[PDB]
Design a protein around this ligand. Sequence first.
Ligand code: RO9
Length: 263
Amino acid sequence: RQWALEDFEIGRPLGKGKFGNVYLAREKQSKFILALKVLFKAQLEKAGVEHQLRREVEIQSHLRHPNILRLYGYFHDATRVYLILEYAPLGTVYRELQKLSKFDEQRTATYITELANALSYCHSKRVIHRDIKPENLLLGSAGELKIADFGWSVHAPSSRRAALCGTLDYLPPEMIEGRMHDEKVDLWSLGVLCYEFLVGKPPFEANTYQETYKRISRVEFTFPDFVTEGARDLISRLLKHNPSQRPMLREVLEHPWITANSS
Ligand SMILES: COc1cccc(-c2nc(Nc3cc(C)[nH]n3)cc3ccccc23)c1
Protein backbone atom coordinates (compact mmCIF):
# COMPACT_ATOMS: atom_id res chain seq x y z
CA ARG A 1 0.00 0.00 0.00
CA GLN A 2 2.88 2.48 -0.84
CA TRP A 3 2.81 2.82 -4.67
CA ALA A 4 4.83 4.86 -7.21
CA LEU A 5 4.89 5.79 -10.94
CA GLU A 6 7.31 2.96 -11.37
CA ASP A 7 5.20 0.01 -10.30
CA PHE A 8 3.45 0.57 -13.68
CA GLU A 9 3.98 0.46 -17.40
CA ILE A 10 2.03 3.22 -19.14
CA GLY A 11 -0.01 2.67 -22.30
CA ARG A 12 -2.13 4.99 -24.44
CA PRO A 13 -4.75 7.50 -23.14
CA LEU A 14 -8.21 6.03 -22.72
CA GLY A 15 -9.45 9.63 -23.03
CA LYS A 16 -9.06 13.33 -22.34
CA GLY A 17 -10.06 13.99 -18.78
CA LYS A 18 -10.88 16.83 -16.49
CA PHE A 19 -7.81 17.54 -14.39
CA GLY A 20 -5.77 15.16 -16.43
CA ASN A 21 -6.30 12.08 -18.56
CA VAL A 22 -6.76 8.40 -17.98
CA TYR A 23 -4.12 5.98 -19.23
CA LEU A 24 -3.85 2.28 -19.62
CA ALA A 25 -1.45 1.00 -17.05
CA ARG A 26 -0.20 -2.50 -16.33
CA GLU A 27 1.14 -3.53 -12.90
CA LYS A 28 4.73 -4.68 -13.63
CA GLN A 29 4.54 -7.62 -11.17
CA SER A 30 1.09 -9.24 -11.72
CA LYS A 31 0.94 -8.10 -15.41
CA PHE A 32 -2.61 -6.90 -14.54
CA ILE A 33 -4.35 -4.31 -16.77
CA LEU A 34 -5.56 -1.12 -14.94
CA ALA A 35 -6.68 2.44 -15.56
CA LEU A 36 -4.66 5.46 -14.35
CA LYS A 37 -6.26 8.79 -13.63
CA VAL A 38 -3.87 11.74 -13.79
CA LEU A 39 -4.85 14.66 -11.60
CA PHE A 40 -2.58 17.72 -11.99
CA LYS A 41 -1.88 19.53 -8.67
CA ALA A 42 -1.87 23.07 -10.31
CA GLN A 43 -5.38 22.52 -11.57
CA LEU A 44 -6.92 21.09 -8.39
CA GLU A 45 -5.08 23.88 -6.61
CA LYS A 46 -6.95 26.53 -8.49
CA ALA A 47 -10.47 25.20 -9.13
CA GLY A 48 -10.64 24.83 -5.28
CA VAL A 49 -11.07 21.05 -5.14
CA GLU A 50 -7.90 19.92 -3.30
CA HIS A 51 -9.67 18.95 -0.08
CA GLN A 52 -12.77 17.68 -1.94
CA LEU A 53 -10.51 15.12 -3.69
CA ARG A 54 -9.08 14.14 -0.33
CA ARG A 55 -12.61 13.64 1.07
CA GLU A 56 -13.88 11.43 -1.90
CA VAL A 57 -10.66 9.25 -1.89
CA GLU A 58 -10.64 8.32 1.79
CA ILE A 59 -14.23 7.18 1.28
CA GLN A 60 -13.98 5.38 -2.08
CA SER A 61 -11.08 3.43 -0.58
CA HIS A 62 -13.38 1.36 1.63
CA LEU A 63 -15.98 0.48 -1.03
CA ARG A 64 -15.82 -2.98 -2.61
CA HIS A 65 -18.76 -3.92 -4.84
CA PRO A 66 -19.07 -5.58 -8.25
CA ASN A 67 -20.86 -2.45 -9.59
CA ILE A 68 -18.57 0.20 -8.18
CA LEU A 69 -15.31 1.12 -9.88
CA ARG A 70 -12.70 -0.07 -7.43
CA LEU A 71 -10.17 2.37 -6.32
CA TYR A 72 -7.12 0.18 -5.67
CA GLY A 73 -5.12 3.11 -4.38
CA TYR A 74 -3.32 6.34 -5.24
CA PHE A 75 -0.11 8.32 -4.83
CA HIS A 76 1.41 11.65 -5.91
CA ASP A 77 4.49 13.21 -7.37
CA ALA A 78 5.75 16.84 -7.71
CA THR A 79 3.00 17.92 -10.05
CA ARG A 80 0.41 15.15 -10.20
CA VAL A 81 -1.83 13.06 -8.05
CA TYR A 82 -2.42 9.58 -9.51
CA LEU A 83 -5.47 7.47 -8.97
CA ILE A 84 -5.11 3.72 -9.52
CA LEU A 85 -8.50 2.60 -10.79
CA GLU A 86 -10.26 -0.45 -12.18
CA TYR A 87 -10.37 -0.68 -15.92
CA ALA A 88 -13.78 -0.84 -17.56
CA PRO A 89 -12.96 -1.91 -21.09
CA LEU A 90 -16.21 -0.68 -22.64
CA GLY A 91 -17.26 2.94 -22.77
CA THR A 92 -19.41 5.14 -20.58
CA VAL A 93 -23.14 4.53 -20.71
CA TYR A 94 -23.20 8.07 -22.03
CA ARG A 95 -21.27 7.12 -25.19
CA GLU A 96 -23.54 4.11 -25.67
CA LEU A 97 -26.70 6.19 -25.27
CA GLN A 98 -25.34 8.60 -27.85
CA LYS A 99 -24.97 6.04 -30.65
CA LEU A 100 -28.18 4.21 -29.75
CA SER A 101 -30.48 7.17 -28.66
CA LYS A 102 -32.13 4.87 -26.06
CA PHE A 103 -31.99 1.45 -24.45
CA ASP A 104 -34.69 -1.25 -24.58
CA GLU A 105 -36.54 -2.48 -21.54
CA GLN A 106 -34.24 -5.50 -20.95
CA ARG A 107 -31.04 -3.47 -20.91
CA THR A 108 -32.55 -0.59 -18.93
CA ALA A 109 -34.00 -2.92 -16.35
CA THR A 110 -30.63 -4.62 -16.00
CA TYR A 111 -28.89 -1.27 -15.61
CA ILE A 112 -31.42 -0.38 -12.90
CA THR A 113 -31.01 -3.78 -11.19
CA GLU A 114 -27.21 -3.13 -10.85
CA LEU A 115 -27.54 0.45 -9.67
CA ALA A 116 -30.01 -0.70 -7.04
CA ASN A 117 -27.48 -3.27 -5.68
CA ALA A 118 -24.65 -0.74 -5.74
CA LEU A 119 -26.98 1.74 -4.09
CA SER A 120 -28.32 -0.51 -1.32
CA TYR A 121 -24.77 -1.49 -0.45
CA CYS A 122 -23.85 2.23 -0.51
CA HIS A 123 -26.65 2.98 1.96
CA SER A 124 -25.54 0.02 4.12
CA LYS A 125 -22.11 1.66 4.25
CA ARG A 126 -23.74 5.08 5.21
CA VAL A 127 -22.86 6.46 1.79
CA ILE A 128 -25.56 8.43 -0.03
CA HIS A 129 -26.18 10.87 -2.91
CA ARG A 130 -24.36 9.08 -5.62
CA ASP A 131 -23.87 10.82 -8.89
CA ILE A 132 -25.25 8.19 -11.24
CA LYS A 133 -25.80 10.17 -14.41
CA PRO A 134 -24.70 8.35 -17.62
CA GLU A 135 -21.25 9.91 -17.97
CA ASN A 136 -20.43 8.65 -14.53
CA LEU A 137 -21.24 5.13 -15.71
CA LEU A 138 -18.59 2.74 -17.17
CA LEU A 139 -19.13 -0.59 -18.86
CA GLY A 140 -17.05 -3.59 -17.91
CA SER A 141 -16.38 -6.49 -20.28
CA ALA A 142 -19.67 -8.36 -19.62
CA GLY A 143 -21.55 -5.09 -20.40
CA GLU A 144 -22.01 -4.68 -16.61
CA LEU A 145 -22.14 -1.14 -15.22
CA LYS A 146 -19.70 0.41 -12.76
CA ILE A 147 -20.37 3.67 -10.92
CA ALA A 148 -17.41 5.97 -11.53
CA ASP A 149 -18.56 9.14 -9.77
CA PHE A 150 -15.30 10.15 -7.95
CA GLY A 151 -11.88 11.64 -8.72
CA TRP A 152 -13.32 13.06 -11.94
CA SER A 153 -12.38 9.53 -13.22
CA VAL A 154 -14.23 9.85 -16.50
CA HIS A 155 -15.11 13.52 -16.50
CA ALA A 156 -14.38 15.20 -19.84
CA PRO A 157 -12.65 18.59 -19.58
CA SER A 158 -15.21 21.39 -18.89
CA SER A 159 -15.65 25.17 -18.46
CA ARG A 160 -16.20 25.08 -14.62
CA ARG A 161 -19.47 26.82 -15.39
CA ALA A 162 -20.35 23.68 -17.45
CA ALA A 163 -19.55 21.51 -14.44
CA LEU A 164 -21.61 23.58 -11.96
CA CYS A 165 -24.87 22.25 -13.49
CA GLY A 166 -23.28 18.88 -14.18
CA THR A 167 -25.94 17.30 -12.03
CA LEU A 168 -28.91 19.69 -11.93
CA ASP A 169 -31.13 17.44 -13.99
CA TYR A 170 -30.60 14.61 -11.51
CA LEU A 171 -31.32 16.61 -8.38
CA PRO A 172 -34.48 15.85 -6.23
CA PRO A 173 -36.86 18.64 -5.04
CA GLU A 174 -35.42 18.61 -1.52
CA MET A 175 -31.90 19.44 -2.85
CA ILE A 176 -32.73 22.21 -5.32
CA GLU A 177 -35.02 23.82 -2.75
CA GLY A 178 -32.30 23.65 -0.07
CA ARG A 179 -34.25 21.51 2.45
CA MET A 180 -32.48 18.72 4.32
CA HIS A 181 -32.16 15.24 2.82
CA ASP A 182 -31.57 11.51 3.37
CA GLU A 183 -30.94 8.25 1.41
CA LYS A 184 -34.22 8.73 -0.43
CA VAL A 185 -32.36 11.14 -2.80
CA ASP A 186 -30.83 8.09 -4.54
CA LEU A 187 -34.28 6.61 -5.26
CA TRP A 188 -35.17 9.81 -7.17
CA SER A 189 -31.90 9.55 -9.20
CA LEU A 190 -32.82 6.00 -10.09
CA GLY A 191 -36.14 7.27 -11.45
CA VAL A 192 -34.45 9.98 -13.54
CA LEU A 193 -31.99 7.39 -14.89
CA CYS A 194 -34.71 4.93 -15.69
CA TYR A 195 -36.57 7.56 -17.65
CA GLU A 196 -33.34 8.70 -19.34
CA PHE A 197 -32.35 5.16 -20.40
CA LEU A 198 -35.84 4.63 -21.96
CA VAL A 199 -36.34 7.92 -23.80
CA GLY A 200 -32.85 9.26 -24.41
CA LYS A 201 -33.08 12.36 -22.30
CA PRO A 202 -33.79 12.94 -18.63
CA PRO A 203 -37.41 13.98 -17.75
CA PHE A 204 -36.79 17.57 -16.63
CA GLU A 205 -34.70 19.10 -19.43
CA ALA A 206 -35.36 22.82 -20.00
CA ASN A 207 -33.45 25.95 -21.18
CA THR A 208 -33.16 28.23 -18.14
CA TYR A 209 -32.01 27.30 -14.64
CA GLN A 210 -35.34 28.75 -13.50
CA GLU A 211 -37.43 26.67 -15.84
CA THR A 212 -35.55 23.56 -14.64
CA TYR A 213 -36.03 24.68 -11.06
CA LYS A 214 -39.80 24.92 -11.76
CA ARG A 215 -40.13 21.53 -13.49
CA ILE A 216 -38.19 19.75 -10.76
CA SER A 217 -39.77 21.38 -7.66
CA ARG A 218 -43.26 20.75 -8.93
CA VAL A 219 -42.49 17.45 -10.70
CA GLU A 220 -43.72 18.37 -14.15
CA PHE A 221 -42.82 15.48 -16.52
CA THR A 222 -44.54 13.43 -19.28
CA PHE A 223 -43.94 10.04 -20.92
CA PRO A 224 -43.82 9.49 -24.61
CA ASP A 225 -46.25 7.05 -26.29
CA PHE A 226 -43.86 4.02 -26.27
CA VAL A 227 -43.04 3.92 -22.53
CA THR A 228 -44.89 0.82 -21.29
CA GLU A 229 -47.25 0.55 -18.38
CA GLY A 230 -44.81 -1.12 -15.92
CA ALA A 231 -42.05 1.40 -16.57
CA ARG A 232 -44.38 4.38 -16.00
CA ASP A 233 -45.50 2.62 -12.88
CA LEU A 234 -41.90 2.38 -11.62
CA ILE A 235 -40.73 5.78 -12.71
CA SER A 236 -43.84 7.34 -11.28
CA ARG A 237 -43.20 5.80 -7.88
CA LEU A 238 -39.61 6.98 -7.83
CA LEU A 239 -40.30 10.48 -8.94
CA LYS A 240 -42.58 11.48 -6.05
CA HIS A 241 -42.15 14.92 -4.50
CA ASN A 242 -42.36 13.52 -0.93
CA PRO A 243 -39.02 11.79 -0.14
CA SER A 244 -40.66 9.17 2.12
CA GLN A 245 -43.22 7.99 -0.51
CA ARG A 246 -40.30 6.74 -2.62
CA PRO A 247 -39.83 2.91 -2.54
CA MET A 248 -37.25 1.03 -0.52
CA LEU A 249 -34.50 -0.15 -2.88
CA ARG A 250 -35.64 -3.65 -2.09
CA GLU A 251 -39.12 -3.00 -3.64
CA VAL A 252 -37.37 -1.63 -6.70
CA LEU A 253 -35.55 -4.98 -7.10
CA GLU A 254 -38.90 -6.85 -6.44
CA HIS A 255 -41.01 -4.60 -8.74
CA PRO A 256 -42.59 -6.82 -11.40
CA TRP A 257 -41.39 -4.65 -14.35
CA ILE A 258 -37.74 -5.26 -13.27
CA THR A 259 -38.22 -9.03 -12.70
CA ALA A 260 -40.12 -9.30 -16.02
CA ASN A 261 -37.17 -7.59 -17.71
CA SER A 262 -33.63 -8.10 -16.15
CA SER A 263 -31.25 -11.19 -15.51
C1 RO9 B 1 -14.85 11.62 -21.11
O1 RO9 B 1 -14.98 10.19 -21.12
C2 RO9 B 1 -13.89 9.41 -20.77
C3 RO9 B 1 -12.81 9.92 -20.07
C4 RO9 B 1 -11.72 9.11 -19.74
C5 RO9 B 1 -11.69 7.78 -20.10
C6 RO9 B 1 -12.76 7.25 -20.80
C7 RO9 B 1 -12.78 5.88 -21.14
N1 RO9 B 1 -12.59 5.00 -20.15
C8 RO9 B 1 -12.60 3.68 -20.30
N2 RO9 B 1 -12.41 2.84 -19.26
C9 RO9 B 1 -12.00 3.23 -18.05
C10 RO9 B 1 -11.70 4.45 -17.59
C11 RO9 B 1 -11.36 4.26 -16.31
C12 RO9 B 1 -10.92 5.34 -15.31
N3 RO9 B 1 -11.44 2.96 -15.99
N4 RO9 B 1 -11.84 2.35 -17.06
C13 RO9 B 1 -12.83 3.16 -21.57
C14 RO9 B 1 -13.02 4.04 -22.64
C15 RO9 B 1 -13.27 3.56 -23.92
C16 RO9 B 1 -13.47 4.43 -25.00
C17 RO9 B 1 -13.43 5.80 -24.81
C18 RO9 B 1 -13.20 6.27 -23.53
C19 RO9 B 1 -13.01 5.40 -22.44
C20 RO9 B 1 -13.85 8.07 -21.11
